[model samples]
Target: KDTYTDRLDDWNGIIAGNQYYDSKNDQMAKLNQELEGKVADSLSSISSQADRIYLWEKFSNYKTSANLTATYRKLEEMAKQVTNPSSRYYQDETVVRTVRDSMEWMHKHVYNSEKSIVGNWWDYEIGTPRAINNTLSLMKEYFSDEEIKKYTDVIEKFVPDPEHFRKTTDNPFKALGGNLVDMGRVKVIAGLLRKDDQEISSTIRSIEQVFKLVDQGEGFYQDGSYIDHTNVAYTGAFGNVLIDGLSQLLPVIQKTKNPIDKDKMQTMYHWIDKSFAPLLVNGELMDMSRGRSISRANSEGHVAAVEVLRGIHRIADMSEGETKQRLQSLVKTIVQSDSYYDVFKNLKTYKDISLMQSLLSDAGVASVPRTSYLSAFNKMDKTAMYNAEKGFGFGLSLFSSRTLNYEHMNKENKRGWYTSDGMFYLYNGDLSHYSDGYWPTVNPYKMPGTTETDAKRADSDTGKVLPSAFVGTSKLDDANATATMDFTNWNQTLTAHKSWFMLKDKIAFLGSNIQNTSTDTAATTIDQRKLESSNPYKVYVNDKEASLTEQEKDYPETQSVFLESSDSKKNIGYFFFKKSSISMSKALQKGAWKDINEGQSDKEVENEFLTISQAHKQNGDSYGYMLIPNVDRATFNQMIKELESSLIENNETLQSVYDAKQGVWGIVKYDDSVSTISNQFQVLKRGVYTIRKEGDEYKIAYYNPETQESAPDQEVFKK
Candidate 1:
């Protein structure tokens, strides 16, 4: 009968980890330990900040937006100790006094003051409100009803509208994606404190736009691609923020009188299965989809997965029948398979740890199979997971005129210029390939599967919208895929026609019509990876071992090259389509995180690297190679001796390949003037096409990169 009390109970339950999720005895003990540590840290932070002002201090210089927002976050942590009944500090008057003192000081001296904000508007509007509201909601016992209303009024001043941000020239897009979720959360918490149901309902209604599919301008697309800041593929960092915010807010609101609409929740459920599940392989989120968050030292792949699973857990609570079972199965699979980080130990709340325990113990719920498939996230201009069954997967990043080159913001990912230029990633037994110091230390210009030139970039933290249209990928079947790029470098001084033919075991790379107008040299890197720290592997050029020095040496008549680790599962083999001079090296690479991003560590760290590339000249430079992973030396030598696929056509007009064993033909047509390229199939148009011989008939697939169209005339093609 009492809806206000019911809603407050749910909010407190989420903050204290009590009502919604079960808490085992061990989880309780762990929660107690974690709470103590946080309270100690909160006290320490408050004491240090207080000491800093007296020791040295301007309102502008001492209390920047970031510093003020951090104070609110610490207040929230200290208040949580007072809210949780299981903690020894539960309802402790001293903890409450410390939190209330800090909150009132920040509210008057900084947050509600007349002084101008001295940092990014995001902290003043979104970041500070989010932390302060969560802190206020947990401390209802410390303040009167009138005083609570007074503090919430201050929060409402900064977040006037839930649907939009504080307007400025640099920020124009409506609050959508992660921003909308965060804003909505702030409003909901403030309404809970003020007991205003209408404000909560209005904010929840505005958040429906976040669930809607968007074709452009920062949201989830129909093709399982989540984009933010226009062109960044952020299905990992910002995507998790949106999902987690929804999970936290929905459960509390659903228990109240003003419930959210059913359709929005249904759309969120569809996103869990279709949009998010494919990106999670084993447990790690794909680095190619993480955008600029990859440069941050704390945001690891497994850490991102915890937030994803938390959202999935809340979704499961609001689902039924097979839908609920499937969601639980996905959670179990990711948790059991993740060998990198323990998701349970590091969850934000102890209730999630208890929930994971229950999910893992259920023997009836089967684990999702790690099947082999290639997903074409066409809307975001990327493709991933070409060979997942072999305990590994491949990620290929592509961009076109529709999307920008890469992301550079917040003094992070400053050197991410070439991340979208067909930068290739391989995930295998070595889980730390991309996660551990790869971005800050690796040579940014020589990224794998990209054709780059030796020209100096204008500066760090720069990006541009690419000026080409034929850039996308097509899924031919479950195990095979094709991608094409009408290449033009960021500087516009180099160009090429690049394509990739992927299979279950290996992928072949092809490039043609490569030209460079700049005086510097151009080259396509075949492979570049960080070696194992303790026992590095060996690289072989045909039968003889190559030099291990940092200098690049040319193998003039190289037939095949192989890299075998101490553990054979981490091996990689290279098969050149033609005999060529390839530059190869295995050397130590040393750099600091300050080289890539600002405010990061400047201390030097080193890693052994292996790089192989085919150097390009001024004009008409071309190269091709097949990269095979997790293969033994005998199998690699045998496969190179008897190749099943042959390059049938390689020129400016078209590039085609025929696999005799599979009866498959892969073609990428650059020009429509010429038609007679292969006898197996006829080229219908200027597009990427795949023809497979199925029994007495044939199956055809076509994707026009120029028009971004997928429809093709099946009647015109016959064997």
Candidate 2:
């Protein structure tokens, strides 16, 4: 009565909840009627994934029927299939039968998140327990009296006592929201199947209490960004599970006596809309903060678009009436984002197709725009500023001492120490651009969009840690953003004043006061290319197509050459000053850096592809570049061909770039030259700021990258 027969909406209910027998449940009859010759796949024992899904579908149908003979007969077949040895998708394959067996090999691994941990434990299966338990719960009602106690007794041994997933308490955040939610989800279902009121109430309270978190509480941030090791945007990693698990459990929790309250519901919605959504830069998740596994394998851009899209879509059906307003707000967000419905339209999975069908029934379906794009996602606290430019889309994972550069250990977001300092990722509608080359074979130090000292290159490590603190301020106007990055090197011997001025479809990037004190310091501002191949590979220097030399094939590392300008993205130009040089490399390289970060085992990574980097070996150096997102090659060539007046370096000492053609400027030194510009901002000393006056639209933002709590617009400056 507590389940569907009380509120059977449709097949989704049958999909999520346990099926029961009797005339009160027409779902069994409906499903049995629907299954007449509907299943053709043979279900014997564990095999490939297709066979398992087919068997699960058939079992779901047959187990819900009143015919006891058919039900147990099918159960016997399944039990034997699972218990049998030598099957590919092994069930009960590992004989280590602790009480936690259900969470172990009693289940088989299926989910992608669960497969990430391969060698963490002996015969480790991260998701097998949940899969097995779900099957056991769904099939429980069909068991005979003798069958019920026997299976239940076996299942109880696998049940966890408490604290299924450890909640870390080292920092103030104590969040691990994703890990907690995953554990809580299984516990909720296990409690229901067992009718343990204490387990049910306790897990429900834990889920609710997680939502009360704000600020640096660790799980979810007040600004809506999520952090597991470092920042994980809503599209993938930690944020994905929080929304998905919450949606699944919300429906069951609401009907109970202790429901999640009003304030917490809105916070979740705020994250859905404010934090998670709007990151589909041309329908791909921002690559900068997608976490450790990004370069391990590559896909078409925005594979994670499905994460929030599915998350927001599922939460709607589970939400209570009082929260429907926030549901509508999320619907508004959905209409604006480019969910992967179309991206995965041809390669549809079972879940994708059903979700598409489920979404079509709702009134919200028509509200979604066929195409959605966002300009930027700027979270100052996280030092992650992502831009989904119309032409040259990019994402940045800048580092500050306030937060981690990337996961140094555990998952080993390998190669983070260098990539973190003013690290930016550039994408221009090409999904497979970064998808090639073995990750361990490439040079970790010479990555694109970084300025680092050429010191001993070590991937992510637990060696002596460095101190990096926020030395600048950042402010955003929801559209255009300006920020400063005073980043310290891992060894603390080098520092750079890096700043970016993002104005609509253009970004003015400048790096000033780059100083390295140590002897082994040979720094280069790197701009490398993906190991992936594109047929029409072309770049230019001074509008001439750059030709490769035999040095590319013969040399182990690329050779540096003087460059007045460069443009591979024909749509945008990367122009270095008259004194700068460039490096081009295309060779087969190999690496096993993860051996240091993940394992000390005698193993290494190996892959070979092309990588391009631009380095500056000068001391007390500075560099400047500009981005043109919505332009053709001809326009880009024309701009760089006529650079002196169209775009101005203005003053290297003042640290400013003037786009006088657009009647705007990016000023870093905020001195006498700044206050004289316009009326939008006033006197500023030190820190980073930008001023703009395009037609009637004026945007002014100032943040001191220096003072701890110095308020801008108060003195309008920092010491």
Pick the TM-score winner.
Answer: 1
How would you encode candidate 1's per-residue C-alpha lDDT over 1-719 as one tens digit per residue?
Answer: 14654666666666556443333566666766776797886665445364344211212344456666666777777777777776667788888887777666666766773444557777777788878777776777677777778777766766667777764334545788898999887887888778887778878877777889887778888878888887777878888989988887888877766677786667887677666877776677877777777777667676677788888887786677898898898888877887767776556675666677778888988876656767788877888764555677788888888887778787878888888888888877787776667777788888888999978774354777778888887677877777888999987899999988776677778899999998888998888888877657777888567765788888978878988777666888888878878898877888878777675788787777899898987588788777788887888888877663467767777787666668777788887654554465566578887778787677777888777787756533544
Give one digit per residue, the lDDT tens place, for model 2 in 1-719.
34422221222232332122222433333333232212112233322353343223333332222222232333332332232232222243331122123222222432122232222221111133344334444434333334333433433333343344321112222225775665555566555555566876777777766675445534655544565554333235566667766666676667666667766676777766556654444455555555554543433234555555556766765565745545544444443454322543321122333444445446643443323233233333333334433545555656455555555545454565555566666655444444333345546676555677677765536322226444443444543556566666777777666767665555656776677777765444445544333333455555555665424422122211222223333244555434344555555556554442453223554444444444445556766666554455666656655544323333434565555555555656634344433334444555555556657665556665444343545455321
Candidate 2 yields a Cα-based lDDT of: 0.47
TM-score of 2: 0.71
Cα displacement (angstroms), candidate 2, residue 74, comes to 17
- Candidate 2 contains a number of clashing pairs equal to 17
Runs with alpha carbons beyond 4 Å of true place in candidate 1:
16-32, 48-63, 86-88, 113-117, 167-172, 386-388, 674-678, 714-719
